[PDB]
Design goal:
The structure is cut from a larger assembly and holds chains A (38 residues), B (430 residues), C (437 residues) and D (171 residues).
Chain A: H1 7-30
Chain B: E1 3-8, H1 10-28, H2 42-45, E2 51-54, E3 58-61, E4 63-66, H3 71-77, E5 90-91, H4 101-125, E6 130-136, H5 142-158, E7 163-166, H6 181-192, E8 198-200, H7 204-214, H8 222-236, H9 250-257, E9 265-271, H10 286-293, E10 313-318, H11 323-336, E11 349-354, E12 364-369, H12 375-389, H13 396-399, H14 405-426
Parallel strand pairs in B: 1-4, 1-6, 4-5, 6-7, 7-8, 8-9, 10-11
Antiparallel strand pairs in B: 2-3, 9-12, 10-12
Helix pairs in contact in B: 1-3, 1-5, 1-8, 4-5, 5-6, 6-12, 6-14, 10-11, 12-14
Chain D: H1 2-9, H2 16-22, H3 31-43, H4 50-58, H5 66-78, H6 84-98, H7 104-126, H8 138-144, H9 147-153, H10 160-170
Helix pairs in contact in D: 3-5, 5-7, 6-7, 6-8, 7-10
The chains are: A mainly alpha (38), B alpha/beta (430), C alpha/beta (437), D mainly alpha (171).
Bound molecules: guanosine-5'-triphosphate (GTP) (2 copies) and magnesium ion (2 copies).
PDB class: chaperone
Keywords: chaperone, complex
Entry title: Cryo-EM structure of the TBC-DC-Arl2-alpha-beta-tubulin complex with GDP-AlFx
Chain lengths: 38, 430, 437, 171
Amino acid sequence: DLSLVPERLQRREQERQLEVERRKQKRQNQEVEKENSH
Amino acid sequence: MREIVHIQAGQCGNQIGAKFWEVISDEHGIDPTGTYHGDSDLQLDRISVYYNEATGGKYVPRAILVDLEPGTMDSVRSGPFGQIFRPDNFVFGQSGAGNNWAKGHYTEGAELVDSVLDVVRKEAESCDCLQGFQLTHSLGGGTGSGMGTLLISKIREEYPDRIMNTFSVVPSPKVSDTVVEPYNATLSVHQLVENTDETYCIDNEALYDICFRTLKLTTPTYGDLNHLVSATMSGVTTCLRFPGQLNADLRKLAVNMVPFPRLHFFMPGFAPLTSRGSQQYRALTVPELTQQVFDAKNMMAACDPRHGRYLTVAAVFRGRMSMKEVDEQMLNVQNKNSSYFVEWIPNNVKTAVCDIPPRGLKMAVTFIGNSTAIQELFKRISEQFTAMFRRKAFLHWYTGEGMDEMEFTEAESNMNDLVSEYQQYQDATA
Amino acid sequence: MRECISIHVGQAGVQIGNACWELYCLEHGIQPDGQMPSDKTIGGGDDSFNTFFSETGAGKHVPRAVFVDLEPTVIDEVRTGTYRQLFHPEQLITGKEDAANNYARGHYTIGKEIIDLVLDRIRKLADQCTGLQGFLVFHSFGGGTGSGFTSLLMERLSVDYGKKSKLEFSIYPAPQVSTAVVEPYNSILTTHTTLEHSDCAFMVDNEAIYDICRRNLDIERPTYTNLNRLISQIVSSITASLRFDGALNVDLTEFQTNLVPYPRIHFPLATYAPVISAEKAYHEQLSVAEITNACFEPANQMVKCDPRHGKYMACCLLYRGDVVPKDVNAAIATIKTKRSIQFVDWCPTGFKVGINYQPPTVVPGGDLAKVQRAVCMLSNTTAIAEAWARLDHKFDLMYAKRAFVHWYVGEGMEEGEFSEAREDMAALEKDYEEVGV
Amino acid sequence: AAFQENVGRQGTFPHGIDILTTADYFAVGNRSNCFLVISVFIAGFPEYTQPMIDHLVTMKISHWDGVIRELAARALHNLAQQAPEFSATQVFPRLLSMTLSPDLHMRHGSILACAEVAYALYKLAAQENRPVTDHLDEQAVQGLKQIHQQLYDRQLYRGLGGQLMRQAVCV
Ligand SMILES: Nc1nc2c(ncn2[C@@H]2O[C@H](COP(=O)(O)OP(=O)(O)OP(=O)(O)O)[C@@H](O)[C@H]2O)c(=O)[nH]1
Ligand SMILES: Nc1nc2c(ncn2[C@@H]2O[C@H](COP(=O)(O)OP(=O)(O)OP(=O)(O)O)[C@@H](O)[C@H]2O)c(=O)[nH]1
Ligand SMILES: [Mg+2]
Ligand SMILES: [Mg+2]
């Protein structure tokens, strides 16, 4: 269970999640709709 | 991707092209008539990669003979296997290009490229899924270089996603005595690095030195040059004509032998060395073949592998032998001669075994390398090019046909930057 | 009662799935055509073996597999093979152009054209099931298709069936059997893409299988045929709980709860024992304590690691044969008193014992002998992280020189993806190291 | 060759001998000469000033290759000193309306043509101790002061296509 794992790993996981979310948001903001392939 | 179209420009390209076709037909059992008469199922398991099925169970070639004059076009059609090709696959003019790249790339070539792109789309239409292209031409001759590099550009502009492979034959002052061959060679390079994906370096000086010193020949002829070029072609394409897991298609071979876009010049090698009318009863062992294939004497280019660093190496052993022994020999060669191999591309030496040895030989070995020593093949060209361009000699032939000194400057710059990049990658993390 | 839906994509993935299905029917008594004489109920399906097989009103026991390939080669072998009458034409999807060892060409180019077809087949098959557990996907890191199309399918399933498990059985690259120099790039890419889309994935070090075949089986040149026969046995022993009346790991969630404490740490270590050659079949019979002691030996382990250096988080064992619980308990107690097995301070330190009274089974003419008793030990050890360490050694030396990077740039894939995957791998390694404290 | 045949067999082409002696099998070989040197010589007459500039502005400037567009721009620049009134009154306003078209290549070509026309008019006015505003009326001054502003209003500077607009605005 997640409770068995200490908070040291949960904090790092939350930080990594926030970092990747910010990176994805920045990438989406830098993208252009008139140049996508999909 | 299961059909490859073959093209051949210039006299040497057509001759090299006709020899390779004859070799692969004799190896597959396809007699000049077109009917199968071999003795192995593997010969028919990958026959659709170069041939087309026709009524009566016939195998029609998929090549396109291209020229600007009629001599070579009549020489191949009348050859021992000349009947095999298609009568409407021969597209040529009457005047040639006179050893001028401009005449073959902007006038006669620019006019015949229309008809050339007609037969090409005719072969691509009879291909379930085109895989790539395999052109055979020379960088010295005008028609062979200009119009052939004009066909590479047209194919890259038309077909978006298709592999491009060529068998460039670098000239040599020892064979020919024409003065404008340095210019006809440099420009070609300026196109390849920016057009072709794979290109094999078959220097003529290396062939001349191997025929005059090793095979003992007082007057090596163009018949001896075609005997070494066709064997190399049959050896380097043995994986695409027979079953295999290493390099079955052209895309995999490119991905495995092209570490960089501009750097894709592969010096080939084949052993044991033989000549016309010679049968070697002695069967060399596997260690002897592995030691001789890596020797500079058995290289088709005028470059010493020891004076450089390898990037991608692919070896093929054709003949009834054991795989464990071949693997052990390859491991020993990689361990002993480890200083000659970059340590920044792990697992950069591939080995394959085949159960179909060439004709007339029980044991054969092949070598397709991507060492940085190939730069030596260009440095030599550089000296000649610069020496002839600084005093303006025979330049009116080019400027008077639409070209200008800007193109020569551009090609010289591109070739010079290709040498610097090779030297830098050779000393990576020095 | 519930039923799973297995998927096999790629050359390595489909070739192993074929042997697994052959072994599965070999054990169930299902004839090559599909008729099961042992089954007395026609049209009804509610037994243990129905988790991997459906039933027509004629008797035919169709598998629940999805064979998708981007080139007509491996699919043709099974279509014109021995179990072609076992599968249906619709479940045997085929494409045309091959990825040619490239994650980008398979994920943003030749894979976005056949994904919808595979998804429509995965929906039609699920519609004929009252209950679905998850998806058992079989792929390989070496093949670019197995890294691109498999990742795309997993991502699409995470959105479609957002409440179903997705167990995996990836294949790790080895130089003695490899044909691409770009297998670390695609491997790292697919690992980073699937780290946030899977629950439990078992690795299969090709080097370990090659060593087991060259030493135990006594084979000079082990081939993909022999490796598939040895990996299929372990794959069946692992999934034996989902196909027989057992008492451990009966559901997919049980796997994640008993072998995946940390969501990101989901790469257990599998081992199988014994592995005797066919020649030495009728020689000596090893007891349970004999096959439990060899399980800990690195020679039998599936990954080339050193569990003795690290610690364990969870452990379980599945037996097959005439095994007695008392003997297994005594052997486990002896191993605990002898070996210095250490566990994590915050993790439970116990072995999940699960015996299966069914005898083993092997394919006729195979290199493996019909042993009287076999065992498959699955233990989550931190030493397995070492298997990733060396992999990074192949990613920094090449990526530093920008080697083979144009193939991905020119195929629509961005360059920052490599840096993101490397950062994710570094974070995973840091978490693994922290767990060892 | 067709022009030479028409001049030799009919003799009805205005300035046939001149355009036949300068433009021949050798002089026509070079494209730069044909687009910059021979072009001005052929346009020097009033019978080839309007159609040549019209074709350069409604075709060559909107080509699908950057090299051809730059060559057409240089040709218009060189041919902007043989026709200041026509370049500042019928072609300059013609380009101001095309600089706002949705097409990227067309916008780039129109911007290059406008810049070249402005430079040519300034060079011509410098040789007469007069300002450049005399040729470029208030209409021209307004559009030229709205090329960079309008482009930024449509976030047109973003992306690969926006890189060419950035380069054009810099030039
Ligand atoms: N190895 C080899 N080199 C050849 C052969 N024929 C010509 N060459 C070389 O090719 C160069 C001359 O080019 P050609 O092939 O004659 O040129 P082309 O393509 O016919 O072009 P044009 O002569 O201009 O019509 C010189 O370096 C020759 O030594 C041949 O059969 N084998
Ligand atoms: N154990 C095992 N490994 C295999 C098998 N087939 C391929 N491999 C390994 O898988 C890697 C390459 O993956 P493949 O399955 O050939 O590739 P693919 O998934 O078809 O990919 P593309 O052809 O690139 O689209 C290499 O490391 C091979 O040695 C197999 O049947 N069994
Ligand atoms: Mg010729
Ligand atoms: Mg494949």
